[PDB]
Every structure is written in structure tokens, then in C-alpha cells.
Amino acid sequence: IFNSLWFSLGAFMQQGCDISPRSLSGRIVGGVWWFFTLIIISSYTANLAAFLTVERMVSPIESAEDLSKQTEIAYGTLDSGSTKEFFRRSKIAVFDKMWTYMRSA
Amino acid sequence: KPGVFSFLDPLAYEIWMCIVFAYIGVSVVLFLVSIFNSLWFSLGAFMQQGCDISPRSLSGRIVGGVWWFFTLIIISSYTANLAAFLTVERMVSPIESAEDLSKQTEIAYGTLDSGSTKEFFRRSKIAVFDKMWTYMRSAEPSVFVRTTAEGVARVRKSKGKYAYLLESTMNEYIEQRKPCDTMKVGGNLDSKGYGIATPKGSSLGTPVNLAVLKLSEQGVLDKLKNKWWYDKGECGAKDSGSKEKTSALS
Amino acid sequence: AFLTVERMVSPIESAEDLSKQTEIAYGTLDSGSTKEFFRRSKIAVFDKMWTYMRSAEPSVFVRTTAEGVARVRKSKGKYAYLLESTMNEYIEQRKPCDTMKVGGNLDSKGYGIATPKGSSLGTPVNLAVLKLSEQGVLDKLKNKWWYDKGECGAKDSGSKEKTSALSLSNVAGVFYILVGGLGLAMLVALIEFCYKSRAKTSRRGRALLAVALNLLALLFATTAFLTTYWCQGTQRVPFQLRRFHTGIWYSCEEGEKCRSFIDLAPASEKGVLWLSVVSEVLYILLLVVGFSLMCLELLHSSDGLKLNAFAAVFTVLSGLLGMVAHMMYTQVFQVTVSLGPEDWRPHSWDYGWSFCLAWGSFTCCMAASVTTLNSYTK
Amino acid sequence: LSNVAGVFYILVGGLGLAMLVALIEFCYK
Amino acid sequence: ILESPYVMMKKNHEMLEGNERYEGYCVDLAAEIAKHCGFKYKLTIVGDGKYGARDADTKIWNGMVGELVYGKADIAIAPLTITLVREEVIDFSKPFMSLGISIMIKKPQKS
Numbered sequence: 001i002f003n004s005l006w007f008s009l010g011a012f013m014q015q016g017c018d019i020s021p022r023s024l025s026g027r028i029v030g031g032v033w034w035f036f037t038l039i040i041i042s043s044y045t046a047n048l049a050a051f052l053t054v055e056r057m058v059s060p061i062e063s064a065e066d067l068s069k070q071t072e073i074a075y076g077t078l079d080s081g082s083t084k085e086f087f088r089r090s091k092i093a094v095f096d097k098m099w100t101y102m103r104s105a
Numbered sequence: 106k107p108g109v110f111s112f113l114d115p116l117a118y119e120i121w122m123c124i125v126f127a128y129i130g131v132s133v134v135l136f137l138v139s140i141f142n143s144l145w146f147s148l149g150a151f152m153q154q155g156c157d158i159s160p161r162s163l164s165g166r167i168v169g170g171v172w173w174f175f176t177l178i179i180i181s182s183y184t185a186n187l188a189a190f191l192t193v194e195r196m197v198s199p200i201e202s203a204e205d206l207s208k209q210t211e212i213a214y215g216t217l218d219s220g221s222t223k224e225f226f227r228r229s230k231i232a233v234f235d236k237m238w239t240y241m242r243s244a245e246p247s248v249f250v251r252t253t254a255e256g257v258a259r260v261r262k263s264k265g266k267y268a269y270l271l272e273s274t275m276n277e278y279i280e281q282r283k284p285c286d287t288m289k290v291g292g293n294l295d296s297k298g299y300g301i302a303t304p305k306g307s308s309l310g311t312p313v314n315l316a317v318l319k320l321s322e323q324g325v326l327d328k329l330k331n332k333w334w335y336d337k338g339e340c341g342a343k344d345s346g347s348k349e350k351t352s353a354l355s
Numbered sequence: 356a357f358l359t360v361e362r363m364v365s366p367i368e369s370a371e372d373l374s375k376q377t378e379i380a381y382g383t384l385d386s387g388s389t390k391e392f393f394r395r396s397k398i399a400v401f402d403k404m405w406t407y408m409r410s411a412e413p414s415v416f417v418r419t420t421a422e423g424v425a426r427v428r429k430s431k432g433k434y435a436y437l438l439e440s441t442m443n444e445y446i447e448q449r450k451p452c453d454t455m456k457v458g459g460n461l462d463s464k465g466y467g468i469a470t471p472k473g474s475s476l477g478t479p480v481n482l483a484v485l486k487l488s489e490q491g492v493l494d495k496l497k498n499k500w501w502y503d504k505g506e507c508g509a510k511d512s513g514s515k516e517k518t519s520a521l522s523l524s525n526v527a528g529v530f531y532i533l534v535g536g537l538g539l540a541m542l543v544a545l546i547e548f549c550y551k552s553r554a555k556t557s558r559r560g561r562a563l564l565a566v567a568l569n570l571l572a573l574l575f576a577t578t579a580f581l582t583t584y585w586c587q588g589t590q591r592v593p594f595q596l597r598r599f600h601t602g603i604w605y606s607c608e609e610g611e612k613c614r615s616f617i618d619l620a621p622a623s624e625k626g627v628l629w630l631s632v633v634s635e636v637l638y639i640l641l642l643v644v645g646f647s648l649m650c651l652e653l654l655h656s657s658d659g660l661k662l663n664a665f666a667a668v669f670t671v672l673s674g675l676l677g678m679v680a681h682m683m684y685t686q687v688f689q690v691t692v693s694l695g696p697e698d699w700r701p702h703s704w705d706y707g708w709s710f711c712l713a714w715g716s717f718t719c720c721m722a723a724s725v726t727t728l729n730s731y732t733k
Numbered sequence: 734l735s736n737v738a739g740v741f742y743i744l745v746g747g748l749g750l751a752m753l754v755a756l757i758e759f760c761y762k
Numbered sequence: 763i764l765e766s767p768y769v770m771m772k773k774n775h776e777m778l779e780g781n782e783r784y785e786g787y788c789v790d791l792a793a794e795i796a797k798h799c800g801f802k803y804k805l806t807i808v809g810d811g812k813y814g815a816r817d818a819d820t821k822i823w824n825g826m827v828g829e830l831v832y833g834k835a836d837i838a839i840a841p842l843t844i845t846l847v848r849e850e851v852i853d854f855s856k857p858f859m860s861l862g863i864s865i866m867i868k869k870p871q872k873s
């Protein structure tokens with residue numbers, strides 16, 4: 001109420017406090033909340049380890065074969081011109097699948 | 106939808122018992138230093154929060170140290186396994202075989218209300234296929250839908266808790282048809298074949314039959330199978346199955 | 356990095372993955388239509404597999420069917436083999452059952468009952484095929500000769516766990532140092548109840564042991580000074596067998612021969628090597644400084660502890676430069692393996708017998724140190 | 734291990750710098 | 763032809779006689795074809811161990827197909843994959859067992 005808030009800072013995450021509830025009911029009180037706060041920080045790292053890996057696992061594409069491989073990033077050309085007409089004309093299966101996607105995009 | 110029992114995933118269920126079983130064997134030795142109090146002083150060696158009983162130079166220093174050395178290994182491995190679940194995320198299909206539908210009963214399953222597919226379970230004397238027919242005649246409300254797209258919708262409306270049975274080549278095609286929230290699991294339950302039909306006694310029937318044995322032999326029909334299900338398939342399977350780049354904690 | 360990539364590696368299903376990866380070899384029988392199919396199929400995946408199999412060295416085209424079953428089992432997953440699904444049903448039932456069937460069929464092949472082209476009986480046999488397969492009788496006989504006659508399981512093919520969690524066996528190797536650490540602690544608590552109850556030779560008899568352990572610290576220092584062989588250098592080409600027995604400095608080769616092969620490349624690693632000899636000798640030189648002040652203690656036994664505490668400085672400063680020196684050469688020896696050691700590379704890459712003996716040299720420098728300050732208490 | 738080996742020179746050099754402080758403070762007393 | 767599990771030998775094949783000496787998947791079918799077409803059947807193993815391939819030099823069918831072409835055998839119940847050139851000399855029935863090239867690999871180890 002007056003001191004135990006700082007002694008709950010010994011059970012905030014770490015840095016063990018000085019008031020010791022040895023065998024009475026405060027051992028459950030000082031233990032379960034300390035058991036609770038380790039759950040939040042353990043999943044916090046594994047969430048961040050999931051963050052920094054996949055952020056570096058995503059490669060920026062260089063070939064247009066990746067656009068025939070992924071579908072999250074949309075892609076198109078000008079609505080008139082030989083650049084549009086190239087995918088319409090190119091019989092290579094990647095360049096036709098891009099034209100298959102762009103007519104369905 | 107996760108929750109309570111799925112919090113216990115990165116550490117196995119046999120290990121959840123053995124992390125408690127091997128824990129209570131530690132506090133029996135430190136009682137001989139000063140059984141009744143040392144279980145809470147083994148909570149000072151549970152993970153952290155250093156205890157007050159101090160085994161300075163006797164054998165309890167090995168007892169209070171090695172188990173404390175043991176418990177630091179896990180919480181690193183439990184986080185490294187939790188990162189393996191929070192990154193890979195293999196959302197597995199629950200069933201492959203129709204024997205599981207004769208094994209579970211949470212997911213309803215039915216066929217079209219007319220046809221040989223309904224008639225197959227009516228006819229098949231195998232005890233699994235009869236028990237499915239025993240369930241479908243007792244499945245209330247009617248799992249036997251009126252049209253094929255009604256069974257496609259009843260899968261989509263019941264959201265996985267309704268299964269539907271149709272032909273694999275059509276199950277190839279509708280899995281390509283958008284919104285593409287359905288798929289094909291397992292193999293075929295029987296062997297059915299599309300055949301080119303001619304009237305009996307026709308002169309054209311034999312060279313048409315030899316053309317079936319020629320075009321399927323060369324892989325030309327396999328190339329046309331790539332046409333009307335994958336070149337005409339809207340949801341390209343390696344192009345749509347490689348689409349998950351999700352985000353933060355639930 | 357371990358548990359992610361172990362779960363990032365997917366088991367392959369389609370044969371398009373074999374045209375996508377190249378770690379797992381794959382071939383067919385060296386004769387037959389299965390070999391001829393990839394030779395014939397104009398699909399770019401099936402031609403690229405045929406492009407790989409004609410370039411797959413050694414021969415993935417095995418001579419018999421059970422040779423391809425064995426070459427899967429001998430290469431342990433790094434060899435794939437292609438055979439018919441109904442036989443792949445059967446051999447997966449045949450014990451030891453360490454093989455399985457993945458994916459679907461690559462084409463459509465059918466077993467057909469053959470009769471004289473035109474034979475009357477040919478038609479009621481043909482109608483019997485359309486009758487028995489229609490009733491599921493052939494499906495029931497498919498349950499007979501592959502599942503009722505199948506040795507491994509009848510529904511046990513789906514009994515394996517797919518995507519499970521961490522194993523207790525990984526946690527089980529730490530149990531014997533947990534329980535064995537408790538059982539060793541039970542011996543200490545029983546004898547110390549007698550040391551409270553049963554009981555100049557204390558401060559001198561332990562200090563002469565500190566001189567005696569430093570003597571063993573000098574002897575195993577010179578044991579790795581010439582290692583008899585640091586590694587069993589093996590280039591066992593089944594060419595011929597090569598069994599190098601290379602020392603720490605003299606790369607001997609073995610029938611018996613020995614050469615030096617000292618001071619390998621590169622020059623920045625040579626700068627480590629010209630610093631490594633500094634780290635090796637300053638271990639042994641500061642051992643001798645530790646002996647000389649402990650020989651003055653024998654004159655006291657014939658300052659005192661002030662010079663003995665000065666000797667415990669340099670016996671620690673000997674081994675800390677030796678803890679540099681034990682980490683100079685093995686990091687150098689990790690680097691020289693990353694060079695692909697010029698002609699003596701080990702497939703039996705295993706540190707020398709004297710280097711385990713040289714581990715005992717440093718711990719005798721320090722077991723001498725934990726008791727020479729025990730006499731400093733008085 | 735070269736990633737670990739770079740911390741050795743601040744480990745051993747931290748010990749060797751600590752040996753100078755313990756020798757001079759015996760003279761400051 | 764001796765194929766597991768299509769035609770296998772008995773453990774008491776010396777004790778059994780004729781059709782009883784041969785066990786397997788094709789043996790259970792040949793009883794049912796005899797139940798459908800009404801005939802006595804004689805299960806016979808092909809001698810050369812060939813499935814009925816065609817020679818390229820002599821252009822003579824060996825195996826089970828040449829036993830059907832040259833009048834040596836009356837019918838074939840065997841694991842015989844239907845090709846075009848086999849149908850060019852003899853008559854198949856419908857494919858009772860559809861299959862194809864499968865991928866036999868190892869099983870994930872219990873290590």
C-alpha cells in the first residue's frame with residue numbers, strides 16, 4: 001500500500017525484493033504475478049524474432065518470373081503500347097502467365 | 106481459434122508433466138541443510154528471484170546450482186520453439202481420409218441428394234463407407250444438398266464444419282475458382298473413369314479408342330490437363346499457396 | 356536458427372520439386388518405360404528431370420528394382436526412386452518399412468486383362484472388369500493383398516505425428532547430470548558429518564602439492580609440444596585410401612613417413628601464427644617463473660607467503676596466455692580446414708590425444724592455485 | 734568462434750588492465 | 763508372371779497342385795473371372811520372365827503377349843500396363859487398376 005508497490009517492482013520483471021513472504025499466502029501472491037510477467041516477455045522476443053527474420057526473409061524481386069510466382073504485388077503496363085502488346089505477343093510461359101494475370105488483375 | 110490448451114504448444118505435454126515431476130525432487134535435499142520450506146526455496150531456483158537459504162560451501166550448492174542451470178536451458182528452448190510456431194505457421198488440415206469422418210463427428214459431411222456419389226455409400230459394403238452412410242442418413246439437418254454449388258456454399262457457410270464429396274477433377278477446378286477458400290484433401294475413395302463413348306458397332310469406335318491410348322501416352326492429355334485447370338485455373342497453386350506474410354501477436 | 360530451418364525444410368511431394376532442388380538425387384530403373392517416360396515427355400519439368408538424370412553422376416539408374424529400394428535406404432533420403440504406385444503401396448508394407456510413397460502419380464497407367472485380339476471370351480472378361488470394379492470387389496481385394504497381406508499396418512500409415520513439438524529425449528541427456536549431480540552430492544553430505552565429528556602438515560603438505568601439480572602442468576605442456584598426431588587425416592577415396600597422421604607441427608603421413616608442413620597460408624593467418632608461437636611459449640616461460648619462487652619456498656621449508664602470492668600471479672598469467680594459446684591453434688585449425696587443407700584434409704576430423712592431455716596441463720596450473728592461497732589464510 | 738574470439742581481447746585485456754589497478758592501490762594505502 | 767502381391771508362390775507349393783500352387787492378387791481375380799465367364803482356368807508362369815515386350819530386331823513378341831499372339835496361351839491375367847503397341851496385336855479389357863509413376867522416397871527417421 002505504501003512500500004509494497006516498490007516491492008512489487010521486485011516482482012515487476014526481475015531484481016528480487018527484500019520483503020520475503022516465506023510460508024504464508026504472500027508466496028502465492030508474489031509468485032503467480034511473477035509467473036505471469038515472464039509469459040509476456042518470453043512471447044515478446046519470439047514475436048520480435050518472427051518480425052526481424054521475415055522482414056529480412058522477404059527479398060526484393062529482380063526478375064519478372066517472381067511476378068509469375070507471387071501474387072501479392074500487382075503489376076501492369078500502360079493501357080496502350082507495345083509494352084502491353086509484348087506480353088500479349090510473347091509465347092514464353094512466364095510472359096504469358098503475367099499476361100494471364102494482368103487480364104485477370 | 107486458439108486459446109487455453111493451445112498455449113501449451115512449444116513445450117510438449119509429456120514435458121509439461123516432467124518439468125513438474127523433476128522439480129519436486131530438488132527441494133528434498135536442501136531440507137537437510139537447515140520438505141516443508143525448501144519447496145518455496147526451490148521457487149527461488151525455479152527460474153529466478155534468488156532465495157534466502159544459502160548453501161555456501163556444502164553439497165547443496167551443487168543441488169541449488171545444477172537445477173538452476175537446468176531451468177535456464179528450457180526457457181531459451183521454449184522461446185526458440187515459440188518463434189518456430191510464430192514464424193512457420195503450418196496450418197494443417199485436420200483430416201485426409203474419409204475413415205476419419207467415420208472416426209470423428211464434429212465436421213458434417215454429405216453428397217449431392219441424387220447421383221452415384223450418394224449411391225456409392227448406399228452400395229459400398231465396406232464398414233467405413235457404410236458407417237458414413239449410417240451417419241449421413243442420421244445427419245440432421247440434411248447434409249444432402251440439392252445442387253453442387255449448394256454443397257460448395259455449405260462448406261463455406263459452415264466454415265470447415267461441413268465436408269462435401271465431389272469428383273477430384275471438379276475438385277481441382279473449383280479449388281482454382283475464386284474466392285478459392287476450398288481445397289481437395291486426401292485421395293479418391295474409388296476409381297471412376299471418363300471414357301469417350303461411341304454407339305455399339307460403330308466403325309469409328311476403335312480408332313477413337315486407339316487415340317485415347319496414344320494421346321494419354323504422349324502426355325498430350327496431361328498438357329491439356331495443365332491447360333483447363335492450371336492455365337485456365339484462376340488461383341495458381343504455387344502462386345496462391347505462397348501468399349502469407351502476416352503480422353503481430355494474437 | 357536450428358528449430359526454424361528444421362521446420363522450414365518441407366518434405367517434397369511433386370516431382371517438380373526435384374526439378375527445383377538438387378540435393379536429393381533421383382533416378383529410375385536402367386531399362387523400362389519409366390526411364391523412357393522422361394525420355395519421351397516433352398513437358399519442361401519432366402525433360403529437366405531427364406536432363407538431370409543424364410547428368411546425375413554417379414548412376415542414379417539402378418540395375419534392379421530392389422537396388423533402387425536399397426539406394427534410397429543406403430543414401431538415407433538423399434536418393435529418390437520412381438516406381439509404380441501399387442508396388443509403392445506394397446513395398447511400403449514390406450518390412451523394415453523405412454520407405455514410403457509421396458505425392459501422386461506422374462502419369463496415368465492401367466493394368467488391363469489381355470486376351471486374343473478378337474477372342475469372343477474377350478468381351479465377357481471385359482464386362483467382368485466393369486462389374487467387379489463397379490461393386491468394389493476389386494477394392495476389397497485391394498485391401499487383401501496390400502493391407503490384409505500388408506505387414507506394416509492396415510490404418511497405421513496415418514498414425515505418425517506430422518507437426519509435433521519439442522522432444523523429451525533432447526531433455527533426457529541432461530537428466531544423468533541432474534540425477535548424478537544429486538547422487539554425488541549425497542556422498543559429500545554424509546562424509547562432512549564425519550569431518551565435523553572425526554577430526555604444520557596442513558599449510559605445507561598442501562603447498563607442496565601445489566608444486567607437485569605444477570610439475571604435471573609442465574609435463575603435459577610439453578606433450579602437445581609434439582602431438583603424435585593431431586588428426587587422423589583421411590582422404591579415403593574408394594584413387595586409394597589415404598590416412599594422414601598429422602601432428603600439431605609435423606604433419607606426418609602414413610608405409611610410415613613424416614613431414615613438417617608447418618606455417619600454412621594466408622598471411623593474416625600467419626600473423627596469427629607468428630602470434631600463436633608467442634602465446635605457446637609465454638605459457639611455458641611463465642611456468643618456470645612459477646617454479647622459481649616455489650623453489651624459494653623450499654628454502655623457507657629448509658618474505659615467505661608474500662613471494663608465494665607473487666608466484667600465484669604468474670601461474671595464472673601463464674595459463675591465461677595458454678588459454679589464448681589453446682584457442683590460437685584450434686581456431687587456426689578451424690581456419691585451415693576452411694582452406695580445405697592442401698593435401699591432408701580429414702574426413703576423420705578429430706583432435707589429437709595430447710590435446711586432451713594438454714587440457715590437464717591448465718587445470719593443474721589452477722589446482723595448484725586454489726591451494727597455494729589456502730596457506731595464505733594463515 | 735571468431736565471433737566469440739573478438740571478445741577475448743577485451744576479456745584478457747580487461748584482466749591485464751585490472752592487474753595494474755591492484756598493484757598501484759597497494760601503494761596508495 | 764510371378765509378381766508380388768499379384769502372383770506369388772505358396773509355402774507349400776510343392777504340396778499343392780496346379781492353380782493352388784500360385785497365390786496372389788491375380789489368383790483371386792481368376793476365380794472371379796471363372797465365376798463370371800464359367801470356365802476352368804490354368805494359371806501358368808511365363809518362362810522368360812518378360813511381360814510381353816516387342817523385340818526390335820526379330821519383331822517377335824516375347825513374354826506373355828507372344829504367348830497370346832502365337833497361340834501358346836489363351837488369356838493373360840497379370841500386371842500388364844496397357845500401351846498402344848500391345849493393343850496392336852492383342853485385346854485388353856478395361857483398366858481395372860489405374861496407376862502411374864509414383865515417388866518412392868525414405869520415411870522421416872525416428873532419431
Ligand SMILES: C[C@H]1CC[C@]2(OC1)O[C@H]1[C@H](O)[C@@H]3[C@H]4CC[C@@H]5C[C@H](O[C@H]6O[C@@H](CO)[C@H](O[C@H]7O[C@@H](CO)[C@H](O)[C@@H](O[C@H]8OC[C@H](O)[C@@H](O)[C@@H]8O)[C@@H]7O[C@H]7O[C@@H](CO)[C@H](O)[C@@H](O[C@H]8O[C@@H](CO)[C@H](O)[C@@H](O)[C@@H]8O)[C@@H]7O)[C@@H](O)[C@@H]6O)[C@@H](O)C[C@@]5(C)[C@@H]4CC[C@@]3(C)[C@@H]1[C@@H]2C
Binds near residue numbers: 473474476828830831
Ligand atoms: C519356337 C516358336 C517361336 C515363335 C513361333 O515359331 C516357333 O512363331 C509363332 C507364330 O506366331 C505362331 C502363332 C501364329 C498365330 C496363331 C494364331 C492362332 O489363333 C488364331 O486363330 C484362332 C485360333 O486358331 C484364334 O482365335 C481362336 O480362339 C478364340 C480366340 O479368342 C476365337 O474366339 C476363336 O474363334 C471362335 O471359334 C469358334 C467359336 O465362335 C469360338 O470358339 C471362338 O469365338 C478362334 O478359334 C477358331 O475359330 C474358328 C472360326 O473363326 C477358326 O478355326 C479360327 O478362327 C479364324 O482363324 C483365321 C486364321 O486365319 C481363319 O482365317 C478363319 O477362317 C477362322 O474363322 C480359330 O482357330 C485367333 O484369334 C487367331 O487369329 C493360335 O491358335 C496359334 C498361333 C498363335 C500360332 C501359335 C504358334 C506360333 C506362336 C509360332 C511359334 C511360337
